[PDB]
Design an enzyme around this catalytic site. Structure first.
Site, PDB file in Angstrom:
ATOM      1  N   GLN A  22      -0.189   6.492   6.764  1.00  0.00           N
ATOM      2  CA  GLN A  22      -1.215   5.778   6.065  1.00  0.00           C
ATOM      3  C   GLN A  22      -1.008   4.320   6.210  1.00  0.00           C
ATOM      4  O   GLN A  22       0.095   3.831   6.453  1.00  0.00           O
ATOM      5  CB  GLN A  22      -1.233   6.128   4.578  1.00  0.00           C
ATOM      6  CG  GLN A  22       0.111   5.990   3.984  1.00  0.00           C
ATOM      7  CD  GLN A  22       0.227   6.509   2.596  1.00  0.00           C
ATOM      8  OE1 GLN A  22      -0.748   6.635   1.848  1.00  0.00           O
ATOM      9  NE2 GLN A  22       1.434   6.836   2.232  1.00  0.00           N
ATOM     10  N   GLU A 108      -6.098   4.146  -4.161  1.00  0.00           N
ATOM     11  CA  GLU A 108      -5.044   4.773  -4.858  1.00  0.00           C
ATOM     12  C   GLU A 108      -4.540   3.909  -5.961  1.00  0.00           C
ATOM     13  O   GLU A 108      -4.417   2.679  -5.802  1.00  0.00           O
ATOM     14  CB  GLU A 108      -3.915   5.111  -3.923  1.00  0.00           C
ATOM     15  CG  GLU A 108      -2.708   5.610  -4.682  1.00  0.00           C
ATOM     16  CD  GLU A 108      -1.677   6.271  -3.846  1.00  0.00           C
ATOM     17  OE1 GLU A 108      -1.860   6.364  -2.610  1.00  0.00           O
ATOM     18  OE2 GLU A 108      -0.666   6.717  -4.440  1.00  0.00           O
TER      19      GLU A 108
END
Lengths: 171, 37
Positions: A22, A108
């Protein structure tokens, strides 16, 4: 207190727990201090800051992770506004193999110390040009599982997808 | 789906080898959601 959110794209991490490839950007706000910090991570290794990229409010950032194999890939953050780009190549010795079964565009509320960081009001993050490559397919988020953050009874995000975008809106 | 930490879109499939997205970095402010206890 610090409030952050991260917006990242990633391979795996959902139904594939072994790795996440990521990269993305943390947006933090602390008492007026806003900071944007690009990072990459091949979870379960630590995220590493892309210290070689400056991200400012209003910049268009392209984030890309590419798995060249289940244990190699690259994370690239391009600041399209500023023309600055950073890539990090993972050349093996990664802390987990990808399953390559999840492709995600994620905002997130990341862990910071023993808790999730206080979730910044980032307004909205829209990932445009949200494309995942599955073999020869270019797949957008339209068929994606939409996730939203719910904490202690509060939904913190509203997420919508389109054929080429994922919008995560802070609620 | 709700999670404690992820918002967004997760494709579940196979052979994802590339994911990309572009976003405009938004202004962040303090969050007002979240619990208090």
């Amino acid at each position: 207190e610090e409030y952050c959110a991260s917006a990242w794209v990633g391979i795996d991490g959902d139904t594939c727990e072994t790795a996440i490839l990521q990269t993305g950007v943390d947006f933090c706000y602390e008492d007026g201090q806003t900071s944007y910090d690009a990072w990459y991570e091949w979870y379960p290794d630590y995220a590493y800051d892309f210290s070689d990229i400056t991200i400012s409010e209003g910049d268009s950032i392209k984030v890309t992770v590419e798995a060249t194999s289940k244990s190699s890939g690259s994370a690239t953050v391009e600041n399209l506004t500023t023309g600055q780009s950073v890539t990090h190549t993972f050349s093996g010795n990664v802390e987990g193999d990808l399953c390559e079964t999840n492709a995600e565009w994620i905002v997130e509320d990341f862990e910071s110390g023993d808790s999730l960081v206080a979730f910044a009001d980032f307004g909205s993050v829209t990932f445009t040009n949200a494309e995942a490559t599955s073999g020869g397919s270019t797949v957008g988020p339209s068929d994606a599982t939409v996730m939203d953050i719910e904490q202690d009874g509060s939904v913190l995000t509203e997420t919508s997808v389109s054929g080429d975008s994922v919008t995560v809106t802070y609620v | 789906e709700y999670s404690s930490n992820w918002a967004g879109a997760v494709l579940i499939g196979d052979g994802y080898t590339k994911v990309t997205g572009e976003f405009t970095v938004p202004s962040v402010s303090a969050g007002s959601s979240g619990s208090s206890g």
